[PDB]
Amino acid sequence: GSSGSSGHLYYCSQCHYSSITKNCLKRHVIQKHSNIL
Ligand SMILES: [Zn+2]
């Protein structure tokens, strides 16, 4: 047998969250974090 990490997801700019595409992930950054400089 064998072992390893899970399939690819795009990771958040400010936490450990991840999603399918940047087009979904940006909504998490808009809603859950301070999306400012
Ligand atoms: Zn996040």
Side-chain angles (χ1 to χ4, degrees):
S2 60
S3 60
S5 55
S6 55
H8 181 270
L9 294 174
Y10 297 81
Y11 280 81
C12 179
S13 302
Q14 298 191 33
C15 76
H16 67 80
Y17 180 80
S18 63
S19 198
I20 51 173
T21 78
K22 296 183 180 180
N23 300 90
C24 195
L25 184 68
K26 67 186 295 183
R27 185 173 62 185
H28 167 90
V29 183
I30 289 162
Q31 291 180 353
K32 306 302 181 74
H33 300 304
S34 300
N35 191 28
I36 48 60
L37 287 303

